[model samples]
Target: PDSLFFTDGQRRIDFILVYEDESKNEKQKRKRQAYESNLICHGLQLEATRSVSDDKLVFVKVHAPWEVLCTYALDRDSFFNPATRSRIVYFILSRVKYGINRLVSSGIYKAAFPLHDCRFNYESEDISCPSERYLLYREWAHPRSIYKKQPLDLIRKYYGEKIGIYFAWLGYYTQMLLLAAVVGVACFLYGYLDQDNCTWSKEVCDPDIGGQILMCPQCDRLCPFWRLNITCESSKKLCIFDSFGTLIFAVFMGVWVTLFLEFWKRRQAELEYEWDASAVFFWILLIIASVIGIIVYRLSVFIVFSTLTPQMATSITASIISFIIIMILNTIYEKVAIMITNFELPRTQTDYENSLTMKMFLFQFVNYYSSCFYIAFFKGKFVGYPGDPVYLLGKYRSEECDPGGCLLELTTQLTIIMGGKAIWNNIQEVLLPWVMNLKITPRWEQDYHLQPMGKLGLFYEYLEMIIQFGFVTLFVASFPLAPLLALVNNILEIRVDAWKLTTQFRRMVPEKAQDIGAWQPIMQGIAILAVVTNAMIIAFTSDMIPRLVYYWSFSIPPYGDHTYYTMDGYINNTLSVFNITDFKNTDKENPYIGLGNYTLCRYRDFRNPPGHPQEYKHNIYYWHVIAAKLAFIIVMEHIIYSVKFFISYAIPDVSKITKSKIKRE
Candidate 1:
């Protein structure tokens, strides 16, 4: 009989075993024992759990079930050790299990498995495995995943933000316009306030001396007005007021100040963005260089003017020399500009870029030294004085004056009349003839090394250089005599133009082209204005200041012993022709005369004492020098203008080059 089991409402089971034969009972017991042993072995080796309730059966099972069970035993052992040690071991084991589980389940495992395992196996097989395989998977995977595309909407959003760029441009344009308006108004006011004294009509009379009657020129008849003797001293002041040269001077100063302020403001603003100490250095250098240049110019003036010659002759010679020097300097400056342009700007962040102050200092230092060298040494040697030829010509002859003196004096006078014509004639007659007859071409032009135009191009270049140099020199030279109108105008022009280009235009231009383009138009306008304004101011001042002095009530001390009344004396003899009867008659031979007699006599003998051939000759000489200087200045101005054009045309990348090209095309 076998055991019978039954479950009912309150489940219970009972089992009994029965054998058919008593002899076979041993065999049955052996069979039952073997079955029990097999069941126990299976239970210990495998993992299975079951829970049964009234309505449900639940079963839980695991694959590789021994790993979990073995881990559990290890954890239990660790717990009996030091608490701290146990905790650390437990934490590590838990983490390892978690990681293993994640690896088995995660998508990364699917992606990495076969390939990674093969690579790992290959590498592990050879202890000296090459690095290529290790690096192969390591390098390619990161970049490929990282470069994966994002939604297109993100790119569009980024581009949309660029619309703010236009607002920046607009802000700059508005600022420039406002600045221009301010400058224009200031310039207008300056010009308006300036009064020309030439239009005034005021008659002054010379007072009557005891027993002598003086008459007023305007009212032809002698009257009580004779008591009001208005002398030359008193007339000079009135003349100054009548001529509007003073007003022009004031206007120029105002313009300069305004422009300077504008640049200063801009520099301040730039400082806020990035601390470019180099900019400050550049400014400082500019100022220092300017000062040095000015000093050199002054020294040259003094040297040329202080020669042992008549005042008039000296002035003429000085002017010619000055013109030559200026032309040479201008030529050098142009070459320097070209060289600098061609040379690449520095790329690295060096001491030069560290601060504006340092940059300015270095630039100015270089500028000053270069200017001095060009003006003093290079030009001086090549453009040797006119005396050089005369010396060579008369080397074998003995003369009263130095061999070159008479020629210099004569040529100087000729220059005054014909301007640079005198110098040109000398060069042609002396230099060109020698060159042609001697078949001696200058090395620079002999081989056509530079260009087919040869010296012709240089000659043309000279013309432009002379213009600018002449203007600058005249402005400086006339400081003592002419109103400071020329100086004021130049200063104003430079400052205003710089402000407009550097600040006003900087704002108007787009970000891509902001650096260079804004300066061109403004600079061009300024250069033109500077030249014109300088010329006008010079002409006006020269013409009007003299007239003002003549009519105004300013006292000028008489030169030498030449009496104002006597015909034999230089002063009297000259004034006699003008019908100027205000002079004292110290000479008994020619008595004090009336204005009518004086005018008639003075006209008849325009070349009176102190106003003889010598004086006239000297004046003529100075006139030529003045002309040459003027020409030099004009030429220099042209060169500068051309350079500005070249910079704007040639290299566009400095700022807004593309836009400029587009507009031009």
Candidate 2:
């Protein structure tokens, strides 16, 4: 408060405006007052609708950092000046404060404070400048990063306990890829691949398909994948389920996953050398005993969640036991690591963190990918995979939704991961300490020497982010909206961590680190998983390939007894080859609804027809689906690899100056 306020009475005026000149534009006095007292909009482009309410004119000046709010509130009695700012006026003036507090709570309006970064001109030497968001905004600023107070530069500059945790994260997020990096490839392919021709054979409403609006050669408003029946009802109008679109996105995903891995490898080695960083041991017999006890605990829990997949059950059981195990292990490790003046572990905190990070991550890694493996493979492999995935691909398959149980399972796990993190962090960092401080003894709580535990590491945050990224990407076909939900959660995420750091915990600084430890491998692992899942989703979940087969059945010529087409048009030889006409109209395909088939069967006549049986079957030693898949992957990988290779060379990982210095040394 002292740092934020005027202690020596240099500029204490708040309620009264003593402008020194009374005759300074008498006619324009009202406008002058508004300009002097109100927060004018910086640029409507930044925000046009403006604030929600009209009580926006603040009589008192606000500072760049938000500490001034507390100071001004504290100083209001003296600064509010009852005589000059009379009761009626001051009462209404508090109206302005109503809106101010609202924005302050939202955690971002401070960036819109339209004021200069002013320093106090105090008479006394005791006064100091108030810190806002950790002096991270030491440089000139506009548009604060993330919420408020937490400016981006401060995270880059002074934000270390050895403070580089946030710094590294900030530095990494610095290359924040715009939509160009995320969806650019998709957009480019959309234009180039001409999905206009990748048209659906028939209407198949499956959301997993990458449907997009492309002006077709036909009508403008009605879109039906260009070749689809747009006039059909919503259920019949199909999705972007074409071979080209699905295959490209899948292959491109693999490409990006590889690219992410490559850069990450370079980042890890680069940071490790810069830190020159460094251990743990055991009470051998007791540790083994504890492990046995934990498994017992795990087994007990496992019985309850028995219906869950082996992977999911194993993970939850492990996490519950391991959290207790790791905490116990950390307790003993800390005792040995410290022994205070008796023995200090001859290692930096970063080394301690790096080693423990692996332990923590190994626990988290399995938890994160456990369910993915189960749902992706195990359940499908063992339990006959519920409904056939090819349901969307054919009229001959089942309905387009899932059994309700699987959805609940996936959601529950994601919630548990995120919710458990928040609860655990708060309990350890704030709740337990504060409770112990009151119930037990402060010294008793402090005796454990758990200083490092309060401040979570960069790796912890990255682990969570990777988990969230997986939540959004890995099984997105099941819940396409997962990413949107994750985005909302992430926005709140920074706020919660920010709140924990700013309020619940004390000044526990960050350790020096140059990189966010493991975002590379984990994120890539998720993306790679996503690629295969999406490919399968495209194959079996959507009717893209099956529709092609359905179309092929229609287009086959009697001579070759195979359906084929060229860019110019449908195969002309088909008309000349087949003489008889007993073709049944399949235009209204599988029209009856309510409950559909339980298996993937083709429309017999329209698909392989008994007549053209000479086709696809006799291929004995021919091109397989596996070959097409491999080709797709190789082609997509080549494009991405070439682009990344060019980008890496064009913009070297190490700067020119750094390279020169290294060469000189």
Candidate 3:
């Protein structure tokens, strides 16, 4: 008897199979024989053994009727293993059904697995395994699959509706409008409205002594008699009343106002939303941070100013530190806001907008306007002049002579005086040829008279006339003050040079030009001319005029008899080192030192002076050397001008000839 049984590791098998009659026994015996012979021989030994009794007599009795038949039967049964049957059953149950379902559900399954019919079992020999169907199904269903069934219909519908395009346009227009409004408001306010004026003055001691008191004779009636007789000559004044400073302030204010307005407007717009508590808290925090930034900026400026000058390195450091601190606080605030909003709120967008606005406002108000105010009020008041221009241009004018006058007026006057003196000296001595030859000619008259010719030619002729007239006027006006003219010329030359190189190039090179061309070459020529002319002017004027003026002012005295008389008196005198006892004799013989003798001499005997021997010895040679060098410089300048004139008309565009020929042909 044989039966299926179960046992735990701690229990024995308790079930068994038994035959009740001989026919049953015979049937069991045949079944057991078949199982043992075929199944065991075919590798179903475990199944065959399970079917028969392990006892030798029982096994022998079971197989007694057909031992060879039973062995052959067991082998035959073993050939058809039960594990293969179970595997085939599992393949049919799991894969075949699932594959068929997928194929029918997704129409693509049939095309994907076209070799097999849907009704056919995938496990059947007639049909291939559903590998193709399985892979296609996975591509559509698998979590990490790369293949995708795109919804082309949805995409077509979206495009056809034009919603996406409209949305993009709307966004673009909104951005443009916002930017334009902000920029426009800023420009109008700052570019048009602001204005400022600053002025100042100081007294400088005269290096040379004059016998007469240098008081203003006109003011004698107002002054005391004692004060009138005082021998102090006051310098002329300076003035600066340009609107540039005011314009700058206005521009700054405009930018600030515009940014402030934009920021407020944006905040108002944001407020219309269903504001969360976090949003409200974020706004409050931002406001607090802004206020703190303002305070910090102000305090930093104050601290830096207290410790250093406005344009000094310390001020730069203060600005950098302030900027860094503000940036850090701003970043932290943004991060905190993002966290509080759970990244759902439009905090980042709002932050970006606010930051841009704030930056524009602060840059204008804090950095620019604050600095302007400091320059205008603090430095402007203390410096005795409005600015450098006033000092440079109006330092020697007549209006500067009065101590109680407006600083600007004084500066202007001083500038005129100094400028006048410089021009007079320069024209009279250094550029004598140019100055002496400067006269109204028939050519000028003809050019001015022919102003009604063809439009272009007439216009050019008129322009030339005006320029010529201006030059003549400048020359005449500056004749009595040559040194000033020289200075002005030098300044003009520098500006012209800069304009030719930088400004001209910027203008001529069109924003959209594809390549460099005629304009570039022309500009190069102009730049070269500017450089040469500037160099020539600087050299000639700096060297010749300065030397001539030096000699005229310091070496040559108007009186002549005094020098010989003094010399004769000194010759006879013994006790007085300078021969003061023979002063009358020397004065009688020679009233003044000869101009030639007054020239700085390098000889040792002539170099030393009575009261300041050491000082004279140290400085005299240096002075003479400086004068000689100046003369050499003047010669070099003339040479430079001559060279420039020689090359001025020479064409610098010869390189373009080949290209031009090719174009024409």
Best by TM-score: 2
TM-score of structure candidate 2: 0.43
lDDT digits (tens) for residues 79-130 of candidate 3: 5322222223223322333142343243311111101111111222223323
Q: Write the per-residue lDDT of candidate 1 for residues 78-166, one digit (tens) a residue.
A: 33322222233333323543142243243211111000111311232434333332333233222232223322222112211111222
RMSD to the true structure for each prediction, in A, is: 34.4, 21.2, 38.2
Better of 1 and 3 by lDDT: 1
List residue ranges in candidate 2 displaced over 4 A. Answer: 1-126, 129-355, 378-459, 471-491, 518-554, 558-627, 630-651, 657-665
User: What are the lDDT figures for the candidates, one per model?
Assistant: 0.31, 0.37, 0.29
Which residue window of length 10 is worst by lDDT in model 3? 112-121
Summed over model 2, clashes come to: 12
TM-score of every candidate: 0.23, 0.43, 0.18
> Comparing candidate 2 with candidate 3, which one achieves the higher lDDT?
2
Tell me which of candidates 1 and 2 scores higher on lDDT.
2
lDDT ranking from best candidate downward: 2, 1, 3
Model 3 TM-score relative to the real fold:
0.18
lDDT (Cα) of model 1 = 0.31
